[PDB]
Amino acid sequence: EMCEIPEMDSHLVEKLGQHLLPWMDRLSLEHLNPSIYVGLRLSSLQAGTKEDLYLHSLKLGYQQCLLGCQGKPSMGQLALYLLALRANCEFVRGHKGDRLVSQLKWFLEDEKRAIGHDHKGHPHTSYYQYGLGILALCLHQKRVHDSVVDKLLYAVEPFHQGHHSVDTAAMAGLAFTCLKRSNFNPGRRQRITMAIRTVQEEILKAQTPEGHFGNVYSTPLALQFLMTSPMRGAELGTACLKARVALLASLQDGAFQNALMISQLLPVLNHKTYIDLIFPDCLAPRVMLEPAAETIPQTQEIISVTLQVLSLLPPYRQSISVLAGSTVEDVLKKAHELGGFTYETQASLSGPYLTSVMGKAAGEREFWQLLRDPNTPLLQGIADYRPKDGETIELRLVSW
Amino acid sequence: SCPPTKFQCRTSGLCVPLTWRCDRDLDCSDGSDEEECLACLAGELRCTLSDDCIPLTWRCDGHPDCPDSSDELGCGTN
Ligand code: CNC
Ligand SMILES: [Ca+2]
Ligand SMILES: [Ca+2]
Ligand SMILES: [Ca+2]
Ligand SMILES: [Ca+2]
């Protein structure tokens, strides 16, 4: 059976795109987002001339910062920039292009070395970024050595060490699919074929009773991967229809606010995936997005949220009053204003990432986890999760 | 129609840095920007005309990782 997601309501799709639209005018390097560009080009929606300026800004920023900048882009982000080039039917080229390719190849080589011949060491970033890097190079018909592919193969193959999310497995599966379709790494062809099936099975076995694969925000990338190949013996069609039901409910309940998440979902709703960047169709008609004329406004209600940090001595626990509809980040700002609380964030393609709390920065294989009561990890970051009145938000330094 | 310390793409108003003016790359859609013109680690190999080291596995992989492309030269091999 095949993984098919029947077209959703055009109105519903349009309002998703309108969430992306304001970002088209935010061209500062801290806000530039190659995933947004890619998601839009693969969608049924377009931003017209704004897109061309956006790509131009991407090319200026990424090439000047990495070859010649305030907090220049990461290698993982460089990989997504490569996807953005494919989305405009370009191959990375010229002397500047060649150098960018080799920088991404160095990233993979360093992660391979960090992982080790034994496969105990972690990558310095994630296996998600490792897969993303292989995919990005493959989409531009750039080859990586079998030894590089081997680390991704071992990570998903039987008796592998560690546990990977649905997102990570899906990204790996996409990388494997590009290698297979391109007939790259022929000395790993059978293992690559087997790994794709392995990822299929693990993703299907991660489907919740609601219908999501892992969770609501893993479902988009999971669907992208599942759409790329048949799955004989399995009921892929049924699983994907159940996911659509789950996806539809989540959409109608306002689950998708984050621009990166929308950019990963929009291709699915247009029956496209990142694998369509092998043979891109850049001139396919797309509906022009117009700004949602919209009176947003304004709450009159005050809510109180308890903010707590038990990972530090002495511990922090305070009730914070904010306007209803405020984010966790607003709570953090208010806590800082009241005195006795500090924190730090850094920019990412998903928005502000919490890196430090009350002077304590997360170290290697550590992060500040966001939770609500009771002991329940948030599915959104500080700038997207909007706590309800009486909620308790915890920041917890954890190791993974 | 926009600042100094920087060259402009003539045929479509997009504006680009001067490090790209006459640099063999087609950065402008029209191509105007080109017209008025140490030890190596084990398992690595040195690029013939420079200081650079690359992994041995980048030899003959279809992409010039060396500035002089020496890693892709004797690559019609057996
Ligand atoms: C790896 C990973 C993943 N994560 Co995290 C998970 N699990 N994540 C990160 C890890 C980063 C560290 C590392 N060494 O890689 C990890 C485990 C620590 C992290 C943290 C969690 N993650 C979380 C979620 C919910 C997000 N994460 C994802 C991006 C989920 C991702 C899956 C996905 N579908 O995208 C994910 C698989 C891949 C991200 C990536 O590398 N993209 C490629 C990269 C090139 O882009 P980038 O923007 O430069 O990557 C940076 C950011 O993604 C930042 N970051 C990671 N997660 C988030 C989440 C938010 C909300 C923000 C603003 C930034 C981040 O870390 C990366 C830098 O290394 C997201 C889809 C995952 C999911 N399916 O649930 C989701 C995000 C959902 C959404 N509505 O936006 C947490 C909030 C969980 C929690 N309750 O604490 C938390 C972030 C808290 C904080 N301190 O701000
Ligand atoms: Ca969201
Ligand atoms: Ca520590
Ligand atoms: Ca040039
Ligand atoms: Ca080479």
Residue linked to tokens 């806590």:
A335
Tokens matching residue A172: 């790996």
Closest by Cα among A155, A143, A237 to A199 = A155
Determine the distance in angstroms separating the CA of A142 from the nearest CA of chain B, rounded to an integer: 7
Please report the DSSP string for A14-50 in residue order: HHHHHHHGGGGG--STTT--HHHHHHHHTSSEE-THH
Helix (H) or strand (E) holding A370: strand A366-372
In the PDB record, what is the listed experimental method?
A: X-ray
Partner A contacted by B26 (CB < 8 A): yes
Residue B27 Cα to ligand 2 midpoint, Å, equals 36
Q: B34 — contact with chain A (CB < 8 Å)?
A: no
Domain ranges (residues) in chain A: 8-296, 297-400
Fold category of A8-296 in CATH: Glycosyltransferase (1.50.10)
Q: Which residues are CB-contacts of A179 (< 8 A; sequence separation ≥ 6)?
A: A134, A138, A149, A185, A188, A192
Helix or strand holding residue B45 (H, E): strand B44-46
Asked if B44 reaches chain A (Cβ–Cβ under 8 Å), the answer is no
Angle of CA points A74, A75, A81, to nearest 5°: 90
Residue A272 burial (10 A CB sphere; 0-12, 13-18, 19+): buried
Asked whether A214 and A208 are in contact (CB, 8 A), the reply is yes
Q: Kindly give the distance from the C-alpha atom of residue A38 to the centroid of ligand 1, in angstroms, as a whole number.
A: 19
Bond prior to A387 in cis (omega within 30° of 0): no
Could you list the residues of A known to form a binding site, using ranges. Answer: 77, 125-129, 163-167, 215, 218, 264, 368-370
Q: Which domains does chain B have, with CATH numbers?
A: 1-37 (4.10.400.10), 39-78 (4.10.400.10)
Residue with the smallest CA separation from ligand 1 atom 69 is A125
Q: 1.10.443.10, 2.170.130.30, 1.10.10.10, 3.30.360.10: which CATH number matches A297-400?
A: 2.170.130.30
Q: Which residue of B has its CA nearest to A100?
A: B65
